[PDB]
Structures are given as C-alpha cells and as structure tokens.
Amino acid sequence: SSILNQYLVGKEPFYQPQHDEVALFEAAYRKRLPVMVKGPTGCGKSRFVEFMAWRLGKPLVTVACNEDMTAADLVGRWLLDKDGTRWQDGPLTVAARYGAICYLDEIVEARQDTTVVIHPLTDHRRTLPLDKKGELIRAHPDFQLVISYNPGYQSLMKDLKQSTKQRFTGFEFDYPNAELEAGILVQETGVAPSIAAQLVTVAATARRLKGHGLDEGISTRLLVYAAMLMDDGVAPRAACRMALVQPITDDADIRATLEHAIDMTFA
Amino acid sequence: SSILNQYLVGKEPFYQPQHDEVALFEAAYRKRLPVMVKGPTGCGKSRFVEFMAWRLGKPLVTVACNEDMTAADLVGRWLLDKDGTRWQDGPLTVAARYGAICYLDEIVEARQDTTVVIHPLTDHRRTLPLDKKGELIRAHPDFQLVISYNPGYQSLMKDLKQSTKQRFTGFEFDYPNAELEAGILVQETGVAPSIAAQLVTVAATARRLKGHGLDEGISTRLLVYAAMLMDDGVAPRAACRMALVQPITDDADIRATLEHAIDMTFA
Amino acid sequence: SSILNQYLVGKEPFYQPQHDEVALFEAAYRKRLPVMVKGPTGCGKSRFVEFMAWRLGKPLVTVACNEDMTAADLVGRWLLDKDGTRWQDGPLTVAARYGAICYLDEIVEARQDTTVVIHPLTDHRRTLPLDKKGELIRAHPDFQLVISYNPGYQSLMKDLKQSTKQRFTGFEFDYPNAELEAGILVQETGVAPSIAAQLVTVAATARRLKGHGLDEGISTRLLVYAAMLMDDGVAPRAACRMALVQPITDDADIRATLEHAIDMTFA
Amino acid sequence: SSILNQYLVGKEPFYQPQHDEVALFEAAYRKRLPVMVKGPTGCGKSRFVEFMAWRLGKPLVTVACNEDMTAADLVGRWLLDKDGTRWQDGPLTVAARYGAICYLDEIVEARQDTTVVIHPLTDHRRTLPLDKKGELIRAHPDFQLVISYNPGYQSLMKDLKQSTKQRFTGFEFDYPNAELEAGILVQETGVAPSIAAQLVTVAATARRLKGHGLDEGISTRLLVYAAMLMDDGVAPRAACRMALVQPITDDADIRATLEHAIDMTFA
Amino acid sequence: SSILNQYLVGKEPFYQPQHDEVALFEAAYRKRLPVMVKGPTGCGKSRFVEFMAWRLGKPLVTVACNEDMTAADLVGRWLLDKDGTRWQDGPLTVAARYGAICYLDEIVEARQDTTVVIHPLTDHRRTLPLDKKGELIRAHPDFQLVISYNPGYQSLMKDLKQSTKQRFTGFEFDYPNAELEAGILVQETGVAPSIAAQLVTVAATARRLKGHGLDEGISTRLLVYAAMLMDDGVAPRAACRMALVQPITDDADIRATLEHAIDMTFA
Amino acid sequence: SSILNQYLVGKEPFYQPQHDEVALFEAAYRKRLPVMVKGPTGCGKSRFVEFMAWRLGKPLVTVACNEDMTAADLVGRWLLDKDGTRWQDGPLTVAARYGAICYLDEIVEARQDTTVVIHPLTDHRRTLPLDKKGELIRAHPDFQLVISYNPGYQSLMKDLKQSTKQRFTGFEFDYPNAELEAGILVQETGVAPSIAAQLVTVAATARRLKGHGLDEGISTRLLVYAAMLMDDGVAPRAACRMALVQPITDDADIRATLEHAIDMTFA
Ligand SMILES: Nc1ncnc2c1ncn2[C@@H]1O[C@H](COP(=O)(O)OP(=O)(O)O)[C@@H](O)[C@H]1O
Ligand SMILES: Nc1ncnc2c1ncn2[C@@H]1O[C@H](COP(=O)(O)OP(=O)(O)O)[C@@H](O)[C@H]1O
Numbered sequence A, B, C, D, E, F: 001s002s003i004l005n006q007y008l009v010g011k012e013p014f015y016q017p018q019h020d021e022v023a024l025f026e027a028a029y030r031k032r033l034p035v036m037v038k039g040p041t042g043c044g045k046s047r048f049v050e051f052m053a054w055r056l057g058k059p060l061v062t063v064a065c066n067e068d069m070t071a072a073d074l075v076g077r078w079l080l081d082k083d084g085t086r087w088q089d090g091p092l093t094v095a096a097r098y099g100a101i102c103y104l105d106e107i108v109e110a111r112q113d114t115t116v117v118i119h120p121l122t123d124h125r126r127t128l129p130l131d132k133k134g135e136l137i138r139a140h141p142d143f144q145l146v147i148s149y150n151p152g153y154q155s156l157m158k159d160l161k162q163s164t165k166q167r168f169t170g171f172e173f174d175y176p177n178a179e180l181e182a183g184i185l186v187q188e189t190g191v192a193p194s195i196a197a198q199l200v201t202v203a204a205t206a207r208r209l210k211g212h213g214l215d216e217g218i219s220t221r222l223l224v225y226a227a228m229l230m231d232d233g234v235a236p237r238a239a240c241r242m243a244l245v246q247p248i249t250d251d252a253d254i255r256a257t258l259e260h261a262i263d264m265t266f267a
C-alpha cells in the first residue's frame, strides 16, 4: 500500500473551534500557503492541524522537533544493505513527494538556521534539494507545510528568524474561554459540566499567576488529565494536585496557593 | 523467551509508602497517563516506580539519563552484521512495542529538547517515530511512560521545558518523617530502632543545613549505608563520618558541624 | 540530458525592476564579477537573480544557506556503491564545472569562515579545490557567483568577513515605493488596484514601526499572501491579520496597533 | 588465561596507612558499598586502592578519567573484523562481569552527567546496560566500584552531581603528618631520615602557601621525586628546585620564596 | 605527468612591487625560511606570493583557510576503493614531498592551535608527521612555507599564537600610494590614468573613514572592480556605488558620505 | 628495520647549555622520572630535548600538540585493509613499547584533561591502556616521557592541571644572557661576533618591552633568522625588520620603536 496510508487520520478527531480557523486554514490550503500555528502548550494546536488533515482528506506526517535536530533528520538517507545500497526518503520528503501535509511540531525548538531548510518549499516554485542523494524534487502540487511553536517558550537566539517567519501565514491560539474549555472537558472525559467549570476556574487562577511565579498557566491538556483522573474515581483534590499543580511548579508557595484554590473549590 | 522477561521485577521490592502514591499511580496507569516523579536524591523514587512495576505485574525498562544523551540512545539502531544488516530496537522502543513500563531516570539530565522525543508517546494516539528505520510504531495499549528528576539539581536551561512538563501527571516526593525513615532503616538493615532514630536525627541536622552550606541534606540512601556499615560492626562515629559526612561536603566547617552532631549523638 | 537542464528557468519569472539592477547585473556578468544582493526579507532578491538567470539564458543552481552549513555541503562527496565507489559533484561544483549561475541564498547564515570557501572562485584565475577528491577544478569561463543576505538580521560575529565582502560587487534592495509595490500585488494576484494600495499602506505602517517594537516591517511576500487570501474570498480584515500581523509579531500591543490600522483601512 | 589476570596486583604495594582506612574499606567491601576517595594530588589515593586490591586478592581495573571521556569509553564496543563482527567488552564491563574492583581515577574530570553511567551499578540490584550491544548485565556479586577525585581542583559545573555523590561512602585523604611522610620517603627511596624530615619541612612551607600564591602545596609524590634524585647523587638544592619548585609554580616570587626556604634548609 | 604541474604558474602574473619584497622573498627562500605576509584584504598579498612562485619557477599549492579547518584538511587521507585501500596525499603533504611552495591563505582564520600543525615543517630539520598513515616525511629541501593573514580582522583568541608567529619572517603590506595604485588600475583594466587617480581618491576617502564608521577602507581589488565595470561602459557613479560602496558598508550615513564623495568626483 | 630508527637523532645537534640541565636530565632519566621543560618560545627547549636524546643514544619521538588534539591522536588505531583488519600503533605507544623518548611538544595546547592520558605512564608501575584495542601495555623500562610548554602563553583553563603538573620534574628555560646568545648566533650562522652582539641588544630591547606593548620579546629563533638573512647578504636594517619586528607585532608604534632601535644599532 501507499507509504502515506499510515499517516492518514482515520477516525474524526474531536476539535472545538474557538474562532474561524477551520475555514481560514482551508483558504490557506487552496492557495497552498504555508501555515504557522502559535500558542502556549496544550491549547489544541496539533489537534487543530490533525482535524484539518481529517477534513481535507489528506495524510498527516507529523515531525516532533528537536534542539539536536539537524537539517538531516527531515529529508532522508542512504541505507547500506546486504543487497548493497538503497535510498530511503525522510518524512518531509515523503510529504513533499506525494502531496501530504507535513507538520513540523515545535519548529522553534531546532537551531534557527537549521530550520531554514524549509525555505525552498515555500518559494513560488516549491522544490526540495536532496543534495546528499543528488536529486532536485519538485514539490507535489497538493503538498502543504504547517509549523507550530510556543512563543516566549524559547530563546531569542533560538527564536524563528524573520526570514522564516515572513514565509508563513499565521494563527494565534490561546486557551479557550471558560465555557468552551469546560465543554471540551465534558466532551473528552464525560466529567460533569459544573465540575468541568470548577476545574476551569482553577486553571484560570493558575493562568492569572503567569508572570507572578509561573512561566505558564495550566494548559487544557492538564485539565483533561485532571478530569480523566476524577472520572476514574480519584478524589478531586488529589486529582487536581496530581495533574494541575505538581506538573507546573516546584515553588512551595505557588504550590500552596494553587492547592488552597483547589481546596476552596473542591471541599 | 520474551525480550522483556529480563526486565521483570521478580521478587517484591520493599517500598514504604509515605502517602497515597500507590493507588494514585494505579489510577494514572488505568488511564494510561504519563507519570512524573519529583524529589531530592535518595528518597525512594526509583524504588517506588519499581514497586509499582511489581504490583502491576509489568516489566520495567529503566534508562539512566545523560547530559550526553542524544535522542539516539533511546530508540534503537542498525547493526552491520557478517550476515549483512539487521535492526535492533532500543529500550524505549521495546517498552513501547510490548506494553512495558519505561522509566526515564534523571530525565532532566539530558539536554532539554533532546527530551522532546517523548512527546509523540504522550499524544492521545501514542506513536513512536523510528525515522532512521523508516517505521511508525503505534504504542502498545499497555505501555506506560514514567520519568524522574531532581528539581533544583539542574540548570534552568537544563530544566524540563513547559511543553514537556505539561504532558505529565506528577508526584512530589520528599524524605520521610522521622518515624517512617527510621522504620525504613530497620527494615532494610536490621539495625536497632533507637539507633535508626539517632541516625535519622543526624540526617535531620544535615537537612536543616540545606541552603546554609549544603546543596542537599543527607538522603535516605546514605542513612541506609550508615546502618549497613554499623551492622557489619563499624564503629558508629566512623560509619556516620564515612556515609553521612564525607559524601556530601568538602567544606571543613560543615564537616566539623556534622561530625560534632554525630559525636553528640553517638558517644 | 545535461545535469543542468533541471536548473534552467523555463518560463519567464515576473520581476519588477526598481532601478537599474538588470543592466548592471549584465555588466557584472560580462566581466564575470561576483554579485552580492543585500536587503530585508521578501523584497525580491531571489526573484531578481532568477529573472537574470532567465534573461541570460543560464541555468540557476540555488543553495539555501545554513547555520549548520559546513564547507562540505557545497562541493560534493564520495558515494559507496554496490558497484564500489563513485564520486558525485555538489551544486557549487556542478555550476563551477559547466558555467551555471550559483546562487548562495542567505550566505551570511553560515558560520563566517565556513563561507571563505568561495574565495578561490573569485580570484582572477578562478579555481575550485576538491581536496577530498584530490581534484583542482578550473572554473568554467561562464560560471557566475551570486550571493544574497539580509544585513542586520544576523550576528556581527556571524556577519560576512571583510575579506569576503570585498570580493563582490553589490546591490542594495529595499521594499519598493507604494505604487510599484501595489503594481506587484496587482500583477501577482489580480487583486484590485485600490485594494493593493490599501494593503501597501498597512505595510507602510508596520515598516514605520521598525525599531519601535518590530525587528522588521511587513515584506512584499506577506502582502502577496494577503492579496492571494483576499482573492480566494477571505475577509480583508481576516486576511490581513493572518498574513500581515500574526507572522511578524508576538507582542500583544504591536498586534493591537497593526490590527487597528487594518480595521481603519478595511471597514 | 583469565582476562583479569593482567589486572592482578602481583607484588604487595607499599602503603602507609594514616588512620583506619584499610579496615573501613574492607567493611565497605563486605557490604558491597561503592567507595569514594577524596584528596589533593599525590597523597596516595591510588596506592591505597591498589593496596586494598592486593589485600582482598582482587584484580584491579583502573581507568584514568578524561574531560573528553564520554559514556562510551567505559563500557565496550563492536569490532568489525575480517571474520565479520565480534564484540569486545570495555574495562568497567569486564570488572562488572567477573567481580573485579573497578577504579575510576579522577572521575570528576569527566563531564558530570557523563558520569551518571555508574548509577545502575550502585542500585540495590546492580546492573550494567550495554544498550549498543542490547545486553543487560547483572553485576557480579563480588564487583566493587571505587572512584577518586581532587575536590576544588575542578569546576563547580564539572563537580560531582549530588545524585552521584550520595551513592558512595567516602574517605577524605590529606598529606600525612611530618613523621609519617618522612617515613614514606625513607621507605620509598632509602634517603636518610633527617634529610627526609628536611624535605618534608620544605613541603610544609609550600603547603602553607596554599591560597597565598599556590593553588596546591607540594604533594608527597614530588617529595618522592626529590628524594629519588638526591639518592642518585643530585645536589639537594638542585633536586629540590627540580622536583619541588619548578613543577608547581610559574610565579617568580613564589619561586624565590620556595628556593630561599630550600637554601635555608640545605646549605 | 607530475602531480605538481597543475600548480605551476604558467603565464607571468602582473605584480607591482611597492618596496623590496621580491629580493627579500628570494633571500628568505635561499635560506628556506618560512614567510608571513600581513596586510588588509585586497592589497596584493596572494598575487605577490604567486609572482614569486612564477619567478622562482616553483609550483604553487594554495590552500584557502577555514574556521572549520581542522588539522585534517591539510595533510591527506585514506580512500576506500573498490580495489580496497589506497592513500592520497593532501596539498601541504604534496608540497612538502616535492619541494613546492605551500601557501596557507588566511591562516589566522583557522582555530589557533589547529594551526600549530606547521611547526614541524619549520624546525631546522623539517618533517611532516602523517600519523594516520604512520609515515614520517622528511620535507623536500626545496619546500617553502608561506602564510598570509589580515591582522585585526580576526579575534585575539583566533589570532596567531606567539609560538607560531615567531617561526616566520615577515612582510607587512598596505595599500599602495596614490600613483602606484592608479598605475595598477591602468595596467589591469586599461582605464584612463586620470580616471584611475579619481577612483583612487575615492578609495582614499573611504580608507580615511577607517575607525570612524568603517572596519576597513576600500581595497585595491574593489577599485579594480570599479575600473572593470567602467571599462564595460557602466556609468562612473553607478560603477563606484556598485563596487566601492555597497560591498563595504550597510550604514546609511557612511553610504551617503561615500556616495557624495563619488558624485563630487564624477559629475 | 626497527620502526624507531627513523626517530634516531643521527648527527649531533648543536646545543649550548645555560646551566646544569644536561646532567640533571641524565639524573632524571636514570630514575625514569618524567621531565617538563618550561620557557618562552624559541629558547631551545626542543633542541635541548633533542641533544639529550642524542647523548643518551635514544630514539626521539616528537609529537606537536594541538587544541584539537584528542586522546586519540597519541595512542594508535585500527586500519581497515583490503586484507581485512590490522592494528597500527601511534607515536606515544611505539615509544612506550620500545623504550624511546616521547616528547610532547606544546603539551598545554591540548585541552587540559585530554592531557590526563599520560598519568598511567607516570605511575610507579608504568602502563598504557589501549582500550580501543583491548590491550594493557607495560611500559618499556627505558621509556622516558618529556613534555614542553610555554607558561602564560595559554589560558588558565587551558593550563596544565595540578594533577598533571605534580607528576613531573621541571626545568625552567629563559633566553640566554647576551654573551651566550651571541655565541649561539655565531655558531649557528657564522655571522660576525660584534654583529651578533648588536642583534642581541635589539632582542634585549624588545624583550624589555614585554608587558608594555609586547606579549613576548624577540626569541633566539628570530635572532637566528636575522643572522641567516644577513649572512645571505640582506641589508642589516631590512633583515632585522623582516625577522625581528614584523613577526612579533602589528602595533605601528611598537614597530616604530623597534625599528628606531634597529636603525640606531645598524647605521
Ligand atoms: N479546541 C480544542 N478542541 C478539542 N480539544 C482540545 C482543544 N484544545 C485543547 N484540547 C485538548 O488539549 C489536549 C492537548 O492538545 P494538543 O493538540 O496536544 O495541544 P498543543 O498541540 O497545542 O500542545 C488534548 O487532549 C485536547 O483534547
Ligand atoms: N519509601 C521508601 N521505602 C523503602 N526504601 C526507601 C524509601 N525511600 C528511600 N528508600 C531507600 O533509599 C535508597 C535509595 O532509594 P532510591 O529509590 O534509589 O532513591 P531515588 O531513586 O529517589 O534516588 C534505597 O536503598 C531504599 O531502600
């Protein structure tokens, strides 16, 4: 079968849109414009991309990005076989060859100008240089490049270069408003609505502590964790300590603050 | 036999719970949520994980984590044989393939975004990219990811990224209270109870010197060492100098302080 | 066929000259003088080079430049085949062998004295040392060296060395004046002229914020993106947020400023 | 014969105990506890370890530790033979396999978390992961781990991590008192007792200059050198300049001070 | 034919001596003393060396020096052939074997003690250690070592070590006086004498701005470029902007100054 | 023939002793004590070592030391042959095997704890671990280790570690007094005695400028260069500019000072 069939999103992933990012991604795709998704960790960027891959009926090749990621990781390599020499394409190369969506997750993790590899794939005529193979690929007309990164979570030297930034269209994601986020919790875990709202208020409290002892507030992912634990019958206070507090802080006082909020919420 | 049989915990490891971490780990596991254990060195984190692996009847694949650990160490490699080419899975890959617990011990030792390798293994659909093999593994439904690290014992640049932190549930371990720690000493070494309490008071004294000449107080492991030495008939003052003082400090005055405490305790 | 035929520019690329850079590039070429194109990102440097390659009827071998680019990337290598040993030329070497234009795009990305590789190709007698092959190439009489870089977008240590700088003739590009840039938008996307002017005023507003919260103003490339999106029926305010604002800033206040400008322009 | 026979200490090495380190090392060994020897250079740490290896009748595998020492140096590797593929164990692996004493000399030289390799060999169940071979070794019940390092002679970043420190029992060595050190000189070189005392007073003088122009005083090893030279008929003043002064300082004034002390001692 | 025949300077290169460097280089050569040429970029150092190689009738092996240049680049390597193993000499090794002039151009680019490779080739008995081949070469009696570098154009840490500096005799080149430099322009390009003088005054103006907004004034090479462009019929103001201004500065005000000088010179 | 015959010093090298370093080196050798030679560049350290190798009738294996020197350079390696696998010893290993003098020239160039490789070769029982070969060499009873370095010419971090320093006996060389240095010039070049004295006064003048604009004064080697040039009929002022001034300074004023001294000396 096709090497891309394993990258197909089979069952529809649940995604709750916050604003018009679905239709706008479809517009970007119809114009084959590269897409950049920005936001804090755990606000549904990858699940958004994955939902779009489902809706467009396109295979999704996701690459998790490194600090030790060289240009080499993405493109492909020469395998020395008993047969004696065969070439094997990398993820980005497969996507570029057969019109798949390539999703560079946490692109800004990689060293900045290790990431200038994607520039030829964003020119008006999109190409991919496999210079170790000696091949010049013309990118499949249906190929779509998507990148993701958490702004402020990386160095200014590790930040995306302007030359790279200005090759993309962009969406800025943030954690959903209280109602939408509660709805996500309820849909994902089946936890009671009012309980979901309570969890969300705890998250709101931590997120309000951003810049005041926390580098980042509580993500939606951790709320999902807390709800999942509760649904398995874990005591609410324990679940929230375990999922919402211990992961994000080592500071004893911030911990005390969050735990007090939790104990005020769940008596 | 199964390649995992060597990773089975055979005999029940002695673990003394401090609070409800056993049942809560079982809850995390039933939901297949990644688990993070935080605490100072020698407070029983690895033995906790190992006890859980025993109680769950799961094989335990432990990886000791490096500063020179690349993404490469974990996944696996191509072996050039006389036969001519065979692939061999790494530890994490074996665990991910056949539903074992993979325990990344001292995860925060590794360069931060060398550690973003585990992100795909924490998505709602858990996968493991062997891109040097060209294989996309779907993680075994019983696979469980556990990491451990000592907060404050590493650089802020070497610290776990928020993107990684917020993918885990968390337990914070600390050294046990006096009675429990004494009980651990007695169970592990057979040393007399009152002597165990005395050792624990020396440890309490050093741990009170944390931030005042010591980077970290005396761990439970060193107390176990001291008790073991005494049980072999080493003089108490010598045993305590040897196990509780010399390992943790080079400062002559801190050494004098700890040795005075010891000599006040063991006349 | 010739290994250079794939590097031929087939269809005439649309380029709008700002001043006399076409004829002056032709003069540099007739004298075989190396050419350096300087300017901010997205001001048509690569498309200029590409247009010249079309007009001169020369193949264009473009290399996108790295931070991890070693001297090795450019020249070529030894391939271990089942046959048993064959050499394969790199891009620069092919261009130097058969009189093609070699275009080092973002040359200043690479480590400075990794870039002193091109010095022998700029002597009065132009040579290319393949010292790993043991070959001394005399550069084809029609070979032309072109480099590109964004000044100020790189480190002073990463900057081009004087020894390298003073081996080139130079063009300084900037974003076109309002009318010319509008004309480019209209030609490239078919967007209405007055709308093109409006987009350009938004770009002017951002470019005026350079040094006051922005590292670089809005490039022509992003204006093209915005126009393309509008032409696909995206709402003007959404298109401009998506193409002109989100890519270039993470600052909430700069974002507010640009978005206010946009909403003042497109009611 | 056994691969360990070459690591046997054959003839009894002369070691002069300062306090009860012999019996205490025997106690640590009977409990299979890892041992750490701390002290300045040339105070007999390695000769102590070597004497214990002689007295215990154990082979001694000594590894001199690097700044460029990776985890790789210690464990072993795959050799590509004409035969076609054989594995060869490293020093630590041989020691761990067949119950030898492995002595990591100057362990703190190596990058700190390159040295966390020895953690599995210090767990209550001692194992050695050869993950490049795919083998999990259970450490021989008679295997004994000993490390050595000079405190203050290395960076705080290069210093032993607390996680590593708190896995060892510890001895702190210092240069012997005057009489014992003289006795060592006499035993090792056959130099006259009163002369040995004189040499020792010169060493005392330099060691008193520690922190006042010297990073470290004169070691016992250099005293041995001076005595050896004198015994070969070198003039005392020349011998002391050559062995006790020139090796430890480049400062002309410190040199003048030490040389004046020497000339006051040896007229 | 001889592997050195390709390194022969065939046609006499035009070199205009400034002072007695020809005869003095001949004296250094007759004594086989290593030669060091110092000066700013584009003042004819390489063409001087090349002229001497012509006049002495010696082949010239030139090596362009790197920041990524290891000791390895210079000496040679083992090639794995289908035949199965052959050795191939590097440039320096060929020169050292058969009495050629080896010219390390921009030697100070390389990491300082990567450059201590040439020390054995400067001893009274000149040798070249190929320790990867296992060969000790005795340098050909006619071998001559020449190095070149731009002082102040490199780091103080990247600067030549004193140990290396004090192994060479030395010439300090600077840009020629007005008349000589004009003469060079006229000889090289056939541009009119008075025009050549005008170009030289522009260069004088920029070179006077050294330390006042310019890191280095206009080199002779760029003057040659300007003259060449003019000779091809490029407008004088355009030629001078293109060759003398754009290459050496990104500062808008320095650019304005130089352009004003040019427009004052060429009305 | 013996692999060491090429390392034999055949003809007696001219060395002028300054004090009793010959007999003292013979004493160190009779006791097999490692020797360290310290001094500025060009004061005859290597020629001293070479003279001792001649007088002792020992082969001399000299290694020039790197900043990129790893532990690997010294010991040896595995060669993949058509035959299929042979081992080849490195320089240090050959010397250690067959009782040659191994001379690590500029040892302090190498990274400090890359240089702790020589520690086992300085123990009372001298061994050499070839752990990549799996061999433990017992050093030949006639093996002699000599190192050389220029104090102050390297970083404090690049400086020799105390652990390494205190394993050697030591000689401190400085440039000879006026008469002896003149005598060296006369013997080496045949230049007239009074002229030799004049050259030496110029060197004295520069050496007096040490710390006042010069990092190091004029070495004896450069004086030899100047004398050699004069003997070939180079004008004294030109010879001294060329050999004594241009190599050691880029400062125009220091240059003026030295040149004035020269012109005062040689009218
Ligand atoms: N808009 C959303 N719709 C559905 N689920 C969401 C949404 N936002 C966040 N989530 C939840 O957050 C968790 C992590 O989402 P993910 O896509 O990994 O975030 P990111 O990729 O931005 O870190 C998922 O379990 C997902 O259910
Ligand atoms: N809760 C506990 N129960 C039993 N033993 C403990 C406990 N805490 C610490 N120890 C003892 O401490 C020593 C080291 O424990 P370990 O699991 O290696 O700590 P960590 O992994 O946190 O460094 C072991 O010998 C163990 O017996």
Ligand SMILES: Nc1ncnc2c1ncn2[C@@H]1O[C@H](COP(=O)(O)OP(=O)(O)O)[C@@H](O)[C@H]1O
Pocket (backbone or CB within 6 Å): A124, C014, C015, C016, C017, C018, C039, C040, C041, C042, C043, C044, C045, C046, C047, C048, C184, C188, C220, C221, C224
């Ligand atoms: N002078 C111009 N003529 C035509 N198109 C231009 C011009 N300047 C910029 N563009 C547009 O800008 C976009 C990016 O141009 P590009 O050549 O990649 O810029 P650079 O290489 O300087 O980053 C292209 O889509 C191109 O249409």
Ligand SMILES: Nc1ncnc2c1ncn2[C@@H]1O[C@H](COP(=O)(O)OP(=O)(O)O)[C@@H](O)[C@H]1O
Pocket (backbone or CB within 6 Å): D014, D015, D016, D017, D018, D039, D040, D041, D042, D043, D044, D045, D046, D047, D048, D184, D188, D220, D221, D224, F124
């Ligand atoms: N206690 C001791 N007994 C015998 N010899 C000693 C003693 N202490 C130091 N020495 C001498 O010091 C020299 C170096 O000792 P070594 O074991 O290499 O010290 P370290 O390993 O601590 O640097 C040896 O020649 C040894 O004879």
Ligand SMILES: Nc1ncnc2c1ncn2[C@@H]1O[C@H](COP(=O)(O)OP(=O)(O)O)[C@@H](O)[C@H]1O
Pocket (backbone or CB within 6 Å): C124, E014, E015, E016, E017, E018, E039, E040, E041, E042, E043, E044, E045, E046, E047, E048, E184, E188, E220, E221, E224
């Ligand atoms: N003395 C000279 N005689 C002839 N040409 C010169 C002289 N000095 C500089 N040039 C010109 O300068 C240009 C670059 O010279 P080059 O030898 O590359 O300088 P460098 O090697 O010092 O950078 C050449 O085109 C050459 O014609």
Ligand SMILES: Nc1ncnc2c1ncn2[C@@H]1O[C@H](COP(=O)(O)OP(=O)(O)O)[C@@H](O)[C@H]1O
Pocket (backbone or CB within 6 Å): E124, F014, F015, F016, F017, F018, F039, F040, F041, F042, F043, F044, F045, F046, F047, F048, F184, F188, F220, F221, F224
């Ligand atoms: N004592 C000496 N006897 C003879 N020649 C000397 C003496 N000192 C210096 N030289 C001369 O100095 C030059 C360089 O000497 P060298 O041994 O390379 O110095 P170093 O190795 O200390 O840099 C040689 O040409 C040598 O003739």
